[PDB]
Every structure is written in structure tokens, then in C-alpha cells.
Amino acid sequence: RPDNTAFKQQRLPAWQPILTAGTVLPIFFIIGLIFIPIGIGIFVTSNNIREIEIDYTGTEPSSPCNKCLSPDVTPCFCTINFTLEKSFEGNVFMYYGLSNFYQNHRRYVKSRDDSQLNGDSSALLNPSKECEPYRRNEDKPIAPCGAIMNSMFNDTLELFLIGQDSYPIPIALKKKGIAWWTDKNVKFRNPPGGDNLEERFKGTTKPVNWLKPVYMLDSDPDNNGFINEDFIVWMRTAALPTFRKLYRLIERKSDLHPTLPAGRYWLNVTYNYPVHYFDGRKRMILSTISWMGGKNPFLGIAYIAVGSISFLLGVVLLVINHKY
Amino acid sequence: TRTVFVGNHPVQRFCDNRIVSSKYTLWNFLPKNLFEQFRRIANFYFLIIFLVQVTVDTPTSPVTSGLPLFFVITVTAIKQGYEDWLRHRADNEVNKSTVYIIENAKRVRKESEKIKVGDVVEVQADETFPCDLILLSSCTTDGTCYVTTASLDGESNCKTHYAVRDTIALCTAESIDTLRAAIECEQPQPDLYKFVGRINIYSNSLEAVARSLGPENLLLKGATLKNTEKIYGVAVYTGMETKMALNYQGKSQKRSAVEKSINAFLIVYLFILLTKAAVCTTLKYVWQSTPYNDEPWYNQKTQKERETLKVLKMFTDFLSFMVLFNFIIPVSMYVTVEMQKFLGSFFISWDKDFYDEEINEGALVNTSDLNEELGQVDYVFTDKTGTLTEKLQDQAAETIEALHAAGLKVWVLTGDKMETAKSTCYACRLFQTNTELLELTTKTIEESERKEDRLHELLIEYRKKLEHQEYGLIIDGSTLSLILNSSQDSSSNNYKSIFLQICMKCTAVLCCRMAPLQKAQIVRMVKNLKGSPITLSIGDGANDVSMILESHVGIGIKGKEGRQAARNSDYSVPKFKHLKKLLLAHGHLYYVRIAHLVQYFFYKNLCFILPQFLYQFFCGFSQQPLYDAAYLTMYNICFTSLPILAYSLLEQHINIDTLTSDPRLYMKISGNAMLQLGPFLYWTFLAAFEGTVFFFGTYFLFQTASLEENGKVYGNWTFGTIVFTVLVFTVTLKLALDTRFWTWINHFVIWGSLAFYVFFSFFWGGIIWPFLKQQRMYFVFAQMLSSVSTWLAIILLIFISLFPEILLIVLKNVR
Ligand SMILES: CCCCCCCCCCCCCCCCCC(=O)OC[C@H](COP(=O)(O)OC[C@H](N)C(=O)O)OC(=O)CCCCCCCCCCCCCCCCC
Ligand SMILES: *[C@@H]1O[C@H](CO)[C@@H](O)[C@H](O)[C@H]1NC(C)=O
Ligand SMILES: *[C@@H]1O[C@H](CO)[C@@H](O)[C@H](O)[C@H]1NC(C)=O
Ligand code: ALF
Ligand SMILES: [Mg+2]
């Protein structure tokens, strides 16, 4: 009368593993002998990464950019002499870092219209209400609406290597390739209508803090608006109040010459972005990469620390059972 | 002290023969149930958080807080409304019966619920009585009557009652002669063997006959009449006052030990949630005291958040921090304990070992809400005739040993007389040869204050100075009435304490000649003493319905008497021996499956929300969710919902073929061990330790300016997608280290829930739909996976996190 089925009788076939000290303690050695080599591998690699940061915020009269903390006739320029000790050979990546800048604030992270930036004609002319109070200006919809956009970083940094004489020679920095391939070719599109861009943004208005509309960010027709890599890079919020956004790409030379030879350099910056109002700091990061990215000791030191704390507890309790 | 006129004829304030076993009216069921439910702290909190999400601010959606709270109400009101409607259906078959009454010189026929005190009822042979009668006569002479009280004392022998002498001649012969009489009785009491009254039969001209009335004339209610063609009574107690209706006590409600823990864990996580929200709100306004910490020229409040009253936003921010951290009290734990209880209860019905070819039936689950209470029993209150004896049953002595080996105390509460009631226990292995009987029967206390001496001669000088195997108590319904009822006279040395101690220090107790309610007053004395012993009562009669309703879990045998106790119990086995497999195997499994689902549901959500609470110190305490609204929503629904539901439905903590062979394994889970303060602080610190490795393990990983060989930076949806991948793999592998019984369903759900979080993350992220107002997670999971330093940071954090669980194993497995 009662269904004598394996499932119903609670008698299915099972595996029933029995893990025990005598079975797990060899696992504390497989970890130690795999995490220490990896830890030293990615700890030596993070040490072969050359880098330099030039804080150019001012805030100390002993700095060149103190003339740009509160200017009067200001298109503002700086010049921050810095020197490279050891050459940079591989690919180099110029960044810009902002500190005390809350790109992850809740009222901030959402102040955007993902459909407007996706080339939607319906949303391009009536932006969302999350992007407020940056939703309309002089009774027109702002072209890129939102606070995330309005506060785009707009400093211009250019490096100069000073040759054997005093003549400074410029370095070639390329703007293309700094934003996720996916959020420039897919997630960020231009308005669909036409081939001329100034007429796709007709019933729109440039953001309040902008100085040139979003169809004037670049002259290159593939880097012109809503697909600009500088724009697309600032739109990807930071996740912490101290962040870095990719700025340029100094590419390795065809010859095996050093990408950035050693010597004295010039960081010419046009000081546009104000950050002292909220006790912020601006810096420039020049760095090389590896299979693991930038220079971060945490991941190496964390594989050693955990590969040694695990290879010891294995030995600790392995002999404690050798008491027999 | 109540005056009854026999024929309602003169020489009021009485009930009317209507038993009411139900609790709800079929008109006011919703107002009274929705108040008994939303008066709990769990059901009332879920409704207060759902109202805030709908009114103030919600991180994901209000539909995911009101839908599970509505399923959990609607489902508990159907159980409670059907389990109660079944009592209406039973009250009707006892009322609305046929009962012939002699109204006016003829044989009227009303229904049982329409009888009134003082009217000559007539009962034929084998007809239950409609009320507590007073035998007036019999068709045949000798003024006798053979009653069988199998629903009052559970026995089935032919009792004998005697009709009033002066009225034994009235046999359908002018029984309606305006028969002058006045039955002066005592107020209704539950004694079931005491009745003091007086009748005043009057004569043709004038009479003074006053014949004393005793329990030999009172024909109680629910006692079939035997070997007698017809009798004639006089309803004296009718409805809710019959001695059978005074020994009921009703059913209040039964909560498990696990559901009383779920309520303690919810009041601990209710203060963890009010501290997370009150610490983040105090810090949020200490951080905003700096003018450039709010409105720092790059995000500014529009005009409505600059004008909102200062004190109205402090209270609204507090509610926004509670709607953000509200996930630490999971609404899905109650949605899953319902599915688990209803689905898991099918293994008792399906069991082929709970099958009797005699009755051609098996086990039966009347309430799936006590599955986990079958594995926490401390006391077992039995019944002698029908449950233990049929001579003893098949294995009534081998089951009482397996109940002592497991650490339970088996008492036998009976209604038979101590002569034969005692002989059996000597065969059930419950009373050994070298066991001294400490008896409190009426054949030992023939005095007023004598037993007060006995309770001392047996406690303060005989048993508590010492040997746990030697003394066994015996009591009586006559004596227990003096100890239980008369315990409000002395308070310096109370009888109920001096006597309760003698019971816990005795091997076994046996109470003879118990009334249906005294079985429920003994089972309630145990429920009170020295903590909270979990009691179980098993009986096959209708007199056992009052202790089956009073205990923590009541088992009703399906036997010769009827299905009166089988339908008032929580479970029903057609045998006594089926109690060993029911609580040793089924009870052990049912408890460990639900006590781990409760520990794991609270842990699994503190690992989830702790990273999101720490994140506030790095935003402006702005209530910015660390994860995407599609991850917040699917964590408890899709990514972590199935693995623990298949653990709760098929997981032999110990092989069940071994759980029945070794009863000693029952004591390992005996005091709610798995849900104590020890195991609770381990799970709560594992979750607070892991939740700190998740966030701070990736906080340091994000100090590099890039994690790719192309030098591209990650945003804040990748920061939270890395904390969520380490979290889903850690809480899923923590349950794979806890699993000891791997069926093909456990591989499918555990490794399928992981392969689905990855397949879904590629599906949800990788397309622009469009039906969303945002495209924030478009390619976040795909880019995060193109970096080798992120695969390693995830492999290292779901190892540092699972270290205290792998290390604790090697400790719990050596020396
Ligand atoms: C006679 C008596 C009758 C008694 C009948 C009882 C029988 C019950 C039958 C079962 C019916 C189930 C109906 C479920 C209704 C649930 C409602 C629902 O889904 O809402 C969503 C809930 C949400 O939970 P929460 O996230 O912790 O809370 C959110 C948080 N409080 C907030 O702020 O908002 O989420 C949850 O409550 C989670 C629920 C558990 C989900 C388990 C089912 C999984 C569904 C399938 C998922 C697919 C996943 C695929 C994985 C691959 C595996 C191979
Ligand atoms: C770069 O550096 C020097 C620093 O004074 C500045 O004078 C020079 O004009 C700058 N070059 C250009 C092209 O602006
Ligand atoms: C640069 O940005 C700042 C702040 O957004 C603004 O005040 C300034 O006008 C901008 N200058 C430009 C766009 O050249
Ligand atoms: F035999 Al009983 F209660 F004593 F059913
Ligand atoms: Mg019985």
C-alpha cells in the first residue's frame, strides 16, 4: 500500500563523504605549496612595474599650481618638473587621480539617463528625472543630462621630455582605446538621425558646466559625442572616494627603445578642474602594466601570508598526530 | 447548589447541551486570525518594512516583500482555518443527533443540542448519552443499567448504575404524570467519580421522600448504554458542563522549539538592524556637518531636498538605512520553512515501516508544523490499554527500552484501576524486579495530612539523598486531586513541588484511575518545571484527547476504540512500536534539517549585507547599495534559494538505517543543541568575519589603478560584482562542506545554483534589452572576468573566508 520508491523511502543512493584530519591535513600542504609560489610570482611582478604620481593640486605656496588655486585671468597653466629614475620600456598608461571625490554617492551614481546616452531619440529630448537638477536648462533638455556628466574632468595634461639641450620634445599620447570596448561600441551610441552630429542634438542644450556642446568634444567623427572615450571614461563611476581614470596611452615604440626614457620631464597642465573647494587632490599617474595590471602589493603579500599560515597549520597539526 | 425540577414542571440559567470545540466563527475568521498573526513580532515587522518600501524608499522593489509576506499569511490562515473548520464538522455530528425526549405524555424527538436541564431523556441500547443524566428507571425492573465509559476512562468493562428506588417503577407508564421531584445537585465539576445530590419525590397529595444521590445514579455523557433496552434519565448538566465537557481544556496552540528559536534569532537580528541603521544615520549627519560634504558642487540637492525639514530627513534616512539592511531578517526563511514542512511531512505518510496490514493503513500527518519537535522530546506520557497493551503489544517493551536509551522519561497515565494497571508495567520492562515502588495510591493515604508525611518520607529521607534505577513512583487519581488541586493551601513546602521532585528522580511514574483532564494536568506540570521539558503524549482513546492536546507533540494511535484521538493529534501511527522509528529516525532528521536551514538563512544574509553596511563608510553614508538591484533581488530567490531547500528535504545527518539502531544518538540534539547560544555565535561571527573579508579583501584589490593587461579601470558596479561573486561562491561552498549525504539532487542544486549565477550574469549582462531605465550591469561580469588578477583575488577570498570552516573540521576530527 505504501509506495516503495527509493525517493519516498528516504533511501536514495548518496555519496556521504567523510572528511577528517587525516584527510584534510594534506590539503593544508597543497595550498601552501601552490599559494606561496603564486604569491611570490605575482609579488615580484608587481615590483617590476614602474610608476610615478605627480600631485599637482597646489594648496602649498611652494607649488607651481598655486597660481591656479584661485585665478583671475584664468585659462590656467602649470609646469611641474619631475624626473624619471629608471626608463619605462613596455606600454605606458597615463592616469589622473581624484581624492575626496565621491563618485559613488547615491544621489550622484544615479544622476544619469542610460537611455539618452544609448542613442534613444525619445529619451534624448525628454531626459529622465534622476538626472536632476541637471535635467533642463533655459527650458531645454540638457544633451548629456545628469550630475555624473556635468562634472566631467576637463584638465589637459601633456608631458615633455627635455633632451640633452634645454629644448623640450613632446610625447605622443593617444586618446582612443581608453574606454571599455563594449561601452563605446554598444552601450554608448549617438543619436540615430543623419551623419552630421550638430543636427542630431537640436532640441538639446550643453550641460551647465560644459564650455562646448557634446558634439564638440573631439573633431574625430568616431570620438565626437556620447562615444567620446574621455566622456565614456568619466561616466563609469569610481567605487571609492579616491580613484583613477585612464587618460592617455603612451604606446611602445616599434624599435625596442624605451617608451619613456629616463631624465627630466615637464607636466604642462591646463588647470581647469577645481578640487580645493571640497578638500580634494589632483595627481597624474604614469604606470606600466603586466599580466596582472598595475602595481598593487596586496595580492602578492596576501598569497604569501595565506600560503605560509596554511603550510604551517598543516605542519603544526601533522606532527601533533605524529605523537604516536 | 443547583435546583433542577425533573419534568420542567414546577413543584433558567443553565447551558443548552451544545458542545463547542471550535475556536473561530465562520463569520469573524479573518479579523480574529489576521490579528493573531500580525500580532507576532515576525509577521508585524515584515509588514512595517513592506509599508516603508511602498511609502518612503526601497532599494529593489516592494513586490518582493509583500508577495512572500502574503503567501506566509494566506498559507497559515488556510491551515488554521481548515484545522478549525474540521472542529465545526465534529461539533455538528455530536449535536444535531437524534434524542427522544418525553415532553408531554408522548415521545418527542429533538436533537442533542436542544435538550434542556431537567427533561426526561430516553436512551435505547447502545446509544451514547446526550448529557449527564440521572437514571430514573428502566423498562425492566431491578433499576439497573450497564454503561461502558470507553470515552471517559478508556476502559471497556461494563460499569453498573442504579436507578432511583422510588422511580424504578416508572417505565413508559405515566412517566409524564407531572412527576413531582426536585433534583438538588452540586455545581458541575470534573471529578468524574464524585457527585453529591438530593431528590425530593412528591406524592399524590404530599410527600417528603428525599433519597440521597451519588455517582451510582449519574449517567455521564459519552457513555454508551449496554445490555439494556431503554432507560429514562433527567438532564442535569447539559453542554459545556457535562463532566465529559469539563475534561477538555481545549487546544491553545503548539509552537516548536525551532520556531521559538527563530523568534529569538529574529529579535537579535532586529537589534543588529536597528544598530546598523542608527549607527549609519548618526555617522551620516556627523559626516554632513561639513558644508562641502553635502552638495560639494558636483552633486547638489535639487530644491526639494534642500527645503525638506531638517528633522523629517533624519527620520526618513533612518528608514532608508533599514530598507537597505532589511535583508538580514529574511522573508524567504518563512517562505522556505513552509515549503520544507509541508514537503518534508510526506516522508512519514510514505514510510512503509509505518504500515499495518491489520488496519490496512499507515502513518498520518495532521500538522506538519511539529516535524522538528519529534526530535526534541524529553518526556513520553503513554496510555496503558490500547497503546501499550492490546497482554503487551508487539514491541511495547522493546520500544520503551529504546526510549530510555535515548534519554527520555516514560510515564504511563491510565484510566484503568491500579490492580491491572500495574501488572502490565511489570511486563513492559518499565518496572524492574529490584525497583522499590513508592506508592501514593488511596490504599496508602487514608487520612487527611498523612500524605504530606508520605511526600517527605519519600523525598527528604528516602529518594533524594540516594541509584537512578531503583525507585519508581505510583499515584492515584484520588490522591493526585489532593496534590494538584489542594496545592494552594501551604506555601512553605508545597505538595506540588515536594511531589514534582519525587517524579524527576524516579525511573518511571504510573498514574492510575486518571480522569481525561488529570492526564492534561500532569502533562502541564512537567511543561513548567526547571526550564521547559518537551513533552509527548500518545494514546488511542477519546479520553487521551486532553493530554494529546496539552503536550508539545501529541501522537494518536489508530486502534480499536476509534479515530477520536487520531484526528485530535498531530501525527498518527497505527501502533506503539512505530514511535521508535518516528522520533529516533524521523525526529532526528526533521530537527537537523530545519535547525540548519535556520542557522544558514541568518548567516547567509549577514555575509550579504555586511559588505553593504561597510560600504557606507566610503560613500557619504548615502545609502548607495553595493550590489545591483537585480542581484539584491535574486540572491534569496535564485542564487542561494534551492541548495538549502534540498538540504532540508533530503539530508541524512546520520544514516537513518543507523539512527534506528543506535538510540544514544538522540541525546546529541537533545536540548536544542544546534540552535543554542554556542552554535549561534559561531554562525554569526563566521558571517561577520566573511562579510569583512569580502569587502576589505576587494577594497585593497582596488588600490592598483587597473586589474587588466590593457590598463582599464573598473567602476563601482564591478566592485560590488566582485563582492557578490565571492559571496555566492562562499555561502554555496559553506553548505557543500556541511552536506554529508550527497544525492543526485544535491549535486544538481548546489553545482547548478553556481553555474546559474554565472550563466545568468552573462545573460543579464551582455544585452541592452531595453526595458530598464538603466544599463549599469551591461558588461560588468564579462569585463571583470577578462582580468587574471581578479580570478585570483576571488579564488583567494573564497578560501580565506572558508578557512575557519575548513580549520574547524580538522579540529573536530582529531583528539
Ligand atoms: C494545506 C496547506 C497548504 C500549504 C501549502 C504550502 C506549500 C508551499 C508550496 C511552494 C510555493 C512557493 C511560492 C513562493 C512565493 C514566494 C514569493 C516570492 O518569491 O517573493 C520574493 C522573496 C523575497 O525574499 P527576500 O529576498 O529574502 O526578501 C527581500 C527583502 N526583504 C526585500 O527587501 O525585498 O523570495 C523568496 O521568498 C524566496 C522563496 C524561496 C524560493 C524557492 C523556490 C525557487 C524558485 C525557482 C528559482 C529558480 C532558480 C534556478 C536555479 C538553478 C538550479 C538548477
Ligand atoms: C611646457 O613647459 C614649460 C614650463 O614653463 C612652459 O613654459 C612651456 O611653454 C610649456 N610648453 C607648452 C607647449 O605649453
Ligand atoms: C572645466 O570644468 C570646470 C568645473 O566643471 C568649469 O568651471 C570650467 O568652466 C571648465 N572649463 C572648461 C570646460 O574649459
Ligand atoms: F487504557 Al487508557 F487512558 F488508561 F486508554
Ligand atoms: Mg485507550
Residues shown for chain B: 815
User: What is the dihedral sign for C-alpha A118, A120, A123, A125?
Assistant: positive
- Domain, as residue range, for B430: 364-387+391-583
How many domains does one find in chain A? 1
DSSP letter string over B111-175?
Answer: EGGG--SS-EEEEETT---SSBEE--EESSSS-EEEEE-TTTSS--S---EE--GGGTT-SSSST
- B627 and A CB contact within 8 Å: no
Q: How far apart are CA B318 and CA B741, in angstroms?
A: 44
Alpha helix ranges (H) inside chain A: 21-24, 27-45, 106-109, 121-125, 147-150, 181-185, 229-235, 298-320
Q: How far apart are CA A147 and CA B777, in angstroms?
A: 19
What kind of experiment solved this structure?
cryo-EM
Q: Which three cell numbers stand for residue B699?
A: 577594497
Q: Is B383 a catalytic residue?
A: yes
* Structural domain includes residue A166: yes
Q: Which residues of B touch A294 (CB under 8 A)?
A: 704-707, 711
Quickly count: other Cβ atoms within 10 Å of residue A90's Cβ.
15
Going by C-beta distance under 8 Å and a sequence separation of 6 or more, which residues neighbour residue A100? A241, A242, A275, A278, A279, A280, A281
- A287 and B CB contact within 8 Å: yes
Q: What angle do CA B764, B769, B772 make, to 5 degrees?
A: 90
Chain breaks of chain B after residues with C–N above 2.5 Å: 11, 390, 466
Q: DSSP 3-state assignment of B569?
A: coil
Q: How far apart are CA B225 and CA B147, in angstroms?
A: 5
- Domain, as residue range, for A118: 55-86+100-238+264-280
Question: Is the CB of residue B63 below 6 angstroms from any atom belonging to ligand 1?
Answer: no
* Residue ranges with strand state E in B368-504: 379-382, 409-413, 436-439, 471-476
Contact B547, B413 (CB under 8 A): yes
Q: Which three cell numbers stand for residue B311?
A: 528633522
Query: What's phi and psi for A270, nearest 5 deg?
Result: -90, 110
* Structural domain includes residue A293: no
**Burial state string for B206-243 with b = 16 or more CB within 10 A and e = fewer than 16:** eeeeeeebeeebbbbbbbbbeebebbbbbbbbbbebbb
Residues shown for chain A: 324
Q: How far apart are CA B290 and CA B177, in angstroms?
A: 101
Q: Which amino acid is at B805?
A: E
Catalytic residue among B378, B383, B416, B628: B383
Mutation target vs B (from A11, A180, A183, A210; most B CBs, 10 A cutoff): A180
Q: How far apart are CA B330 and CA B276, in angstroms?
A: 16
Nearest to A24 among B300, B699, B810 (CB): B810
Q: What angle do CA B501, B502, B508 make, to 5 degrees?
A: 120
Q: How far apart are CA B242 and CA B17, in angstroms?
A: 8
Phi-psi domain of B199 (left: phi exceeds 0; alpha: psi -120 through 50; beta: other): beta
Q: DSSP 3-state assignment of A206?
A: coil
Q: Which residues of A touch B654 (CB under 8 A)?
A: none
Contact B240, B123 (CB under 8 A): no
Q: DSSP 3-state assignment of B793?
A: helix
* Structural domain includes residue A290: no
**Residue closest by Cα to atom 1 of ligand 4:** B385
Question: Is the CB of residue A12 below 6 angstroms from any atom belonging to ligand 3?
Answer: no
Q: Residue A88 forms beta bridges with which residues? A: A260
**Pairing label, strands B535-539, B379-382:** parallel
Kindly provide the resolution of this structure in angstroms, with one decimal: 3.0
Q: DSSP 3-state assignment of A290?
A: strand
Element (H, E) at B203: none
Span from the CA of B336 to the centroid of ligand 1 (angstroms): 7
Q: What angle do CA B762, B766, B768 make, to 5 degrees?
A: 140
* Structural domain includes residue A25: no
Going by C-beta distance under 8 Å and a sequence separation of 6 or more, which residues neighbour residue B157? B148
Distance from CA of B654 to the nearest CA of A (A): 10
* Structural domain includes residue A121: yes
* Structural domain includes residue A193: yes
Is A293's CB within 8 Å of B352's CB?
no
Distance from CA of B775 to the nearest CA of A (A): 6
- A246 and B CB contact within 8 Å: yes
- C-alpha dihedral, A56 to A61 to A62 to A63, nearest 10°: 20
**Residue closest by Cα to atom 18 of ligand 1:** B68
* Structural domain includes residue A34: no
Task: Report the CATH number that the domain containing residue B524 is assigned in CATH.
Answer: 3.40.50.1000
* Structural domain includes residue A317: no
